[PDB]
Design a protein around this ligand. Structure first.
Ligand SMILES: [K+]
Ligand SMILES: [Mg+2]
Ligand SMILES: [Mg+2]
Length: 217
RNA sequence: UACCUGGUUGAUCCUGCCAGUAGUCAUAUGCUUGUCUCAAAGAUUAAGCCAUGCAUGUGUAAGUAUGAACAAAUUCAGACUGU
């Protein structure tokens, strides 16, 4: 079946780690997609966003390969992006799905004004940049919906954000850079220091230290 | 009610525009057009030129009646006193 090759994979298969937030807290790299499948696999959905052909010139013509862009998300604060290039479309799509699973990140959602109910928009103004494409997200009031193009709109929908205002500059017709800028903007949500985070951090044992004895075998 | 997509390349990321998409109590034209309620309409070019018809008249007890105007009365007198 699955034979983990990493300490994190062993812990996830042994049920020692039960939530993706435990891994996110210590910023540990995730190198096996079975970890994500076990943790949040049931609620994850995938979608192929674009199949892009690329060509390399050779002495005997053009060698064509296909680029697959895949977005995964649970619609509840987790989203991932995957890009893979392969000779066959199916292989590229499979690799892109694996990479999108491996890159899932937590998305912070906040309130525009009054803080009643679940969060509905981005906590603050965030901006992402890939290549020349820059994507800006602005908090929006409840009921405003997702005001974004179809690619950013899909990325935001997979992240579970209910309403947001967006603006884009640059070559947004470069779909890869557009989606990557949106992904970077979403990732930057948890890096902004707000007054609610001013409390002193109270550290907890890392999984590799907490379960060192188990991993010692 | 804070949104983009096609097009320069063997392929790439750009600048940049062309094209698309939507709107006008916005004009015109094409095809089509069964019912109800609303409703613009010779401004744009020529404040260019105009046949014909109409679009400014007017009376109360209370300015001026002798129509040779109509009506009712008067057998005798009457300035006039109805229209
Ligand atoms: K009019
Ligand atoms: Mg604008
Ligand atoms: Mg070509």
């Amino acid at each position: 079946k699955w034979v983990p090759v990493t300490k994190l994979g062993r812990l996830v298969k042994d049920n020692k780690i039960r939530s993706l937030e435990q891994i996110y807290l210590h910023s540990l790299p995730i190198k096996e997609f079975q970890i994500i499948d076990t943790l949040i696999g049931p609620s994850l959905k995938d979608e192929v966003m674009k199949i892009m052909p690329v060509q390399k010139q050779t002495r005997a013509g053009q060698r064509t390969r296909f680029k697959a862009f895949v977005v995964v998300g649970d619609g509840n604060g987790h989203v991932g992006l995957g890009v893979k290039c392969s000779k066959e479309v199916a292989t590229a799509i499979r690799g892109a799905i694996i990479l999108a699973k491996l890159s899932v990140i937590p998305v912070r959602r906040g309130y525009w004004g009054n803080k009643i109910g679940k969060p509905h928009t981005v906590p603050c103004k965030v901006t992402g940049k890939c290549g020349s494409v820059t994507v800006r997200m602005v908090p929006a009031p409840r009921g405003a919906g997702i005001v974004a193009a179809r690619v950013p709109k899909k990325v935001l929908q997979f992240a579970g954000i209910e309403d947001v205002f967006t603006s884009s500059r640059g070559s947004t017709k470069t779909l890869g850079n557009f989606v990557k800028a949106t992904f970077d903007c979403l990732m930057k949500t948890y890096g902004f220091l707000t007054p609610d985070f001013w409390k002193e951090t109270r550290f907890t044992k890392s999984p590799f230290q907490e379960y060192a004895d188990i991993l010692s075998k």
